[PDB]
Design a binder for this molecule. Structure first.
Ligand SMILES: [K+]
Ligand SMILES: [K+]
Ligand SMILES: [K+]
Ligand SMILES: [K+]
Ligand SMILES: [K+]
Ligand SMILES: [K+]
Ligand SMILES: [K+]
Ligand SMILES: [K+]
Ligand SMILES: [K+]
Ligand SMILES: [K+]
Ligand SMILES: [K+]
Ligand SMILES: [K+]
Ligand SMILES: [K+]
Ligand SMILES: [K+]
Ligand SMILES: [Mg+2]
Ligand SMILES: [Mg+2]
Ligand SMILES: [Mg+2]
Ligand SMILES: [Mg+2]
Ligand SMILES: [Mg+2]
Ligand SMILES: [Mg+2]
Ligand SMILES: [Mg+2]
Ligand SMILES: [Mg+2]
Ligand SMILES: [Mg+2]
Ligand SMILES: [Mg+2]
Ligand SMILES: [Mg+2]
Ligand SMILES: [Mg+2]
Ligand SMILES: [Mg+2]
Ligand SMILES: [Mg+2]
Ligand SMILES: [Mg+2]
Ligand SMILES: [Mg+2]
Ligand SMILES: [Mg+2]
Ligand SMILES: [Mg+2]
Ligand SMILES: [Mg+2]
Ligand SMILES: [Mg+2]
Ligand SMILES: [Mg+2]
Ligand SMILES: [Mg+2]
Ligand SMILES: [Mg+2]
Ligand SMILES: [Mg+2]
Ligand SMILES: [Mg+2]
Ligand SMILES: [Mg+2]
Ligand SMILES: [Mg+2]
Ligand SMILES: [Mg+2]
Ligand SMILES: [Mg+2]
Ligand SMILES: [Mg+2]
Ligand SMILES: [Mg+2]
Ligand SMILES: [Mg+2]
Ligand SMILES: [Mg+2]
Ligand SMILES: [Mg+2]
Ligand SMILES: [Mg+2]
Ligand SMILES: [Mg+2]
Ligand SMILES: [Mg+2]
Lengths: 121, 133, 129
RNA sequence: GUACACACCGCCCGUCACACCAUGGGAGUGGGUUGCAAAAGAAGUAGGUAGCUUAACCUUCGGGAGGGCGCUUACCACUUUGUGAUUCAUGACUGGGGUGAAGUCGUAACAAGGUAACCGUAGGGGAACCUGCGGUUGGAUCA
RNA sequence: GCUAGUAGGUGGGGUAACGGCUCACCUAGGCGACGAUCCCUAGCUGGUCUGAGAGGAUGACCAGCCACACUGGAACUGAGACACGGUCCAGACUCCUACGGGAGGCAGCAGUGGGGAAUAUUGCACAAUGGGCGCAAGCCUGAUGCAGCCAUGCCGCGUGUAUGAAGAAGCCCUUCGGGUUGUAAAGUACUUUCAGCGGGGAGGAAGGGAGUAAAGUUAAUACCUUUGCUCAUUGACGUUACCCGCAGAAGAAGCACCGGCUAACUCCGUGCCAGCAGCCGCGGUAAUACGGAGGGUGCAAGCGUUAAUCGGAAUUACUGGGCGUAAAGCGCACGCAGGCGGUUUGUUAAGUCAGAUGUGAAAUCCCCGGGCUCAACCUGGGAACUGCAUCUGAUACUGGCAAGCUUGAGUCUCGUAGAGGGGGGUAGAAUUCCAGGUGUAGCGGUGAAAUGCGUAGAGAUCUGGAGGAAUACCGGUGGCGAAGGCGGCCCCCUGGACGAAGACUGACGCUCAGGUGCGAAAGCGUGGGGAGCAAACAGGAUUAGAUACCCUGGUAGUCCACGCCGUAAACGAUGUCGACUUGGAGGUUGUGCGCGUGGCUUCCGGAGCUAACGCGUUAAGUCGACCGCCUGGGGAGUACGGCCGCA
RNA sequence: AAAAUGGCAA
């Protein structure tokens, strides 16, 4: 690109849209679980992965992943969601936070307790 | 569903006012069970919910836990057809309160031992979901 | 068309040095002669000469130190498309001072060092290393 | 030569079936915002004066000057009407796209892929495609 | 595209003041591709974060400016307001009421409800600084000084420290030998910051109020003022910093991580399950990747996670990238605006350069210092603020003006080659059709067939006629044209290129967004024409099927005039113009004297370039000017809107 | 002459 051309039309940067739309520049958002269900992973991974549909205060409804072993979450439970997409689950762009609001910490967790909201023995 | 949300809020407020009133959602059935000191006590609270909170709801006796069983015995073949799976199972009624009994009576490796657990899992899952209701 | 004559002069030297040509000849002009003198004084070119009156021709005698061109690279910093002017403090340094930069100061065309000593800034004609 | 590399028992295209996701159209429908043509006229401010009234000034002592009030006019907020534009939401149904699963039908390309392939264009056909016309090599072969 | 107070003018009115500020009248202007208008978003700045820098992102705290004060509107008073705690009106809300009528505005401080992932006490003092009023005393001050809450951040400090093999137990691992935890702990000798308890103790305090003295002032040693002098007095913080004393290791470590990237490893459980995951991926019975344990690594009153910004990203490349084949050269050309432009002299000084001056708030940043036990923090001075205006110099270069020159470009004279274009005409060969003669049973087609044709005489052969279309050989890696393209011969009209030797003009040039023209085939419209060929279509075959390949037929179309369309792998997948940089073999077309010198063209190849393949004086080498274009693959060159088109 | 196809796998 010649200088004169660049003067006429400047170089433009990419939009670079975010990958966590529902959060809307908020570290966490709160939502009520409309449904809690298990979904199969994309290839080459085989499991039953726990997910929930949560209607956030912002009003966007997004699938969120309930991490750890076991969950107490049911329909109408209030949970706090954070950014983080599950590779092998399509349309899952958020993770539920264990130990926040209704969501309970993983039982019998002695390592990475803060991540799974488990209080020190 | 909109009435459900209103109902939940109404139930919370009523529970705050009256601690002898207990309202909880059964996770299994998804039914909301209301507990009270009297039928009138519950009727008032239901009426309040309808009038004060404008919640339309239907009140009935909670569904009792029900279990299914077989009365007669029969030998049945389940064939799935590459993907291949063939099993012959004899179902017989057990005594009342005897529970579930599974017997592997395969002889001579007609069915590979590796697939026996899969057969059991399939039966167990199907039994849990029932056959009638 | 020949919109930049000076660029052609530098190109002729560079191409001549690559081709192991003893001399490079171009149509003479006052600026080209001035730039040539700087190269001769800095010992990048052995000698320069002008011939003809109606149509003068500038001949530059290239020098090879060890069968390798003395001028490793020659580049036109200021061009018709984009002109570059530098203040005295901002005058460029080539190859950590090993190279020269031809600067057109008010007094005349001179090396960057000479212009910096003078304290007069000017347009940067080219970098010669 | 090759788009194959558990290596042609390779690879791989499209219709159709099913579930789901985002999206376009759609009798329209309901919000937001706004353009234009009008309407409207609280208060205030300015202008005029049917009338009413008047500490300081003047006076022939009657009044005069000047002012206030009221009325009226101009401007103008709310508000109101008609007709457009734009944006958002939703809509029976419908178009194309994407994602599964070992569904169905074929085999279009990749080897000369068994009618070389492909480009533009026109016609035809369940589908990939097929055919005509002109163009390209980003075709193999040649003993 | 926009605009009628609109643009300007004249007069009058108006403002503190200029002014369409306003009004009348007059003229028809003003604005915009250097983006008007309109739509969307937004307080601005000094600064902050990031970055080597250039940039990029941002504008919380502090400071400057602006706007706003329930919403909408208006004015009054005043030096100043169209006024947070003023007025009036209207509206929405809340409240009072005797129902007639009234009251109110936390985006001051604290606080409540609500919303949210989330953000503090309805504190103390006016002791200091500053402000209002006052002669002053003083009064007022949710400014401000302080306190409370919060790991939110930054900084500093602690949680002991020497000794300690018993290499204890206990844990984990183990080849059961042992190794590891680990001198770690116990054991022993010390130290006591900080916390706690006790006792001392700065500084922020200046001034003001009493007197008292002198001087000034005055009629006055009055009073007043001024400066000294003397005596009590002023501190919210506050149980102040700090110092000192006392007891005792007492009262004080957690979080994330260990497949690779990435420093840190095994064991056990689990078995494509449960799970993990930023990326790559891991898990199906020997998992350093899941969960737990031992051990280790990294950090530490924090440690992770999430969100957000910059970097790495040369991945929008000004610094600092590309476009033969990876994404990217407009199909080609003409050309306005714009960009750029040979050589010489004079002149000017716009750019450029130098110096000077004014300014560029303080703070921040940076440097050198100073003060808090140190640090964070506070602070003095300097630097820096890269900018801008003005003045005075310089004149190389760029520009302007003026005069030149010939070298670029162009004009003329002469000749050469050419399927260059448009128009009219004509020839020969062949096919088809029609008529007649001869003649007899096949013809035609295919891998093989069949459909089809023929005894109403085909096919074959000969003769005459008609009509349309294309021009064998020449013919060529040949030529011509900007590209698309252009092929028998003849005439007519017309474009371009090249060579030779002179003359002539005097930079008259190059590129080119927008714009305009031309632009294969197919297609469309109107009117003609129609031999051959042939989408569609029909029949026969082939096949599992055969909407095909093959066979027999056959319509549009192919042809002509005119009009439209505007696209192709419109390709050299290579923009245009100019300069420079080894060679060889050929083609075609001039020209000079076998040897030269021009134009064009084909193949090979050196340096160099390239990811490689290749390109290689016809560059994809080396440079310059200008333009077009690109920024992962799909979705998609599609949707929508616009423009254009008969479609 | 005709001559289709072989899920995804480690
Ligand atoms: K797996
Ligand atoms: K749809
Ligand atoms: K609609
Ligand atoms: K094909
Ligand atoms: K075609
Ligand atoms: K005026
Ligand atoms: K105006
Ligand atoms: K307002
Ligand atoms: K004070
Ligand atoms: K660049
Ligand atoms: K031009
Ligand atoms: K000049
Ligand atoms: K026909
Ligand atoms: K190679
Ligand atoms: Mg729709
Ligand atoms: Mg009025
Ligand atoms: Mg095929
Ligand atoms: Mg083929
Ligand atoms: Mg092919
Ligand atoms: Mg067909
Ligand atoms: Mg705003
Ligand atoms: Mg950088
Ligand atoms: Mg006033
Ligand atoms: Mg006020
Ligand atoms: Mg207030
Ligand atoms: Mg407040
Ligand atoms: Mg809340
Ligand atoms: Mg008060
Ligand atoms: Mg490592
Ligand atoms: Mg294991
Ligand atoms: Mg970058
Ligand atoms: Mg690149
Ligand atoms: Mg390609
Ligand atoms: Mg390409
Ligand atoms: Mg081209
Ligand atoms: Mg100047
Ligand atoms: Mg400053
Ligand atoms: Mg000049
Ligand atoms: Mg040519
Ligand atoms: Mg001619
Ligand atoms: Mg045609
Ligand atoms: Mg036609
Ligand atoms: Mg035919
Ligand atoms: Mg045919
Ligand atoms: Mg195209
Ligand atoms: Mg072509
Ligand atoms: Mg192209
Ligand atoms: Mg051109
Ligand atoms: Mg070559
Ligand atoms: Mg389109
Ligand atoms: Mg369109």
């Amino acid at each position: 690109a010649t200088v004169n051309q660049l003067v006429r039309k400047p170089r433009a940067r990419k939009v670079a849209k975010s990958n966590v739309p529902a959060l809307e520049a908020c570290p966490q958002k709160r939502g009520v679980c409309t449904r809690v269900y298990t979904t199969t992973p994309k290839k080459p991974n085989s499991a039953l992965r726990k997910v929930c549909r949560v209607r956030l205060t912002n009003g966007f409804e997004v699938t969120s992943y309930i991490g750890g072993e076991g969950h107490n979450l049911q329909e109408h439970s209030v949970i706090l969601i954070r950014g983080g997409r599950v590779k092998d689950l399509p349309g899952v762009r958020y993770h539920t936070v264990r130990g926040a609001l209704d969501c309970s910490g993983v039982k019998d967790r002695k390592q990475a307790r803060s991540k799974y909201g488990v209080k020190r023995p | 569903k909109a009435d459900q949300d209103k109902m939940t809020q109404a139930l919370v407020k009523l529970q705050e006012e009256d601690p002898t009133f207990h309202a909880h959602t059964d996770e299994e059935t998804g039914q909301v069970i209301i507990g009270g000191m009297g039928e009138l006590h519950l009727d008032i609270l239901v009426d309040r919910m309808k009038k004060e909170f404008n919640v339309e709801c239907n009140v009935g006796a909670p569904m009792v836990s029900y279990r299914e069983t077989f009365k007669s015995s029969a030998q049945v073949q389940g064939k799935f057809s590459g993907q291949y799976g063939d099993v012959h199972i004899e179902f017989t009624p057990n005594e009342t309160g005897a529970g579930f009994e599974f017997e592997n009576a395969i002889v001579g490796g007609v069915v590979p031992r590796e697939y026996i657990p899969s057969v059991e899992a399939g039966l167990k899952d199907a039994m849990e979901n029932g056959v009638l209701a | 068309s020949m919109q930049d004559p000076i660029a052609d002069m530098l190109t002729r030297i560079r191409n001549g040095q690559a081709a192991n040509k003893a001399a490079v000849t171009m149509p003479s002009s006052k600026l080209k002669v001035a730039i040539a003198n700087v190269l001769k004084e800095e010992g990048f070119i052995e000698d320069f000469k002008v011939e003809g009156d109606t149509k003068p021709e500038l001949e530059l005698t290239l020098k090879y130190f060890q069968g390798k061109a003395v001028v490793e690279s020659i580049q036109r910093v200021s061009r018709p498309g984009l002109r570059i002017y530098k203040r005295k403090d901002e005058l460029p340094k080539v190859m950590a001072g090993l190279g020269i930069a031809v600067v057109s100061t008010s007094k005349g065309v001179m090396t960057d060092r000479a212009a910096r000593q003078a304290g007069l800034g000017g347009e940067i004609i080219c970098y010669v290393a």
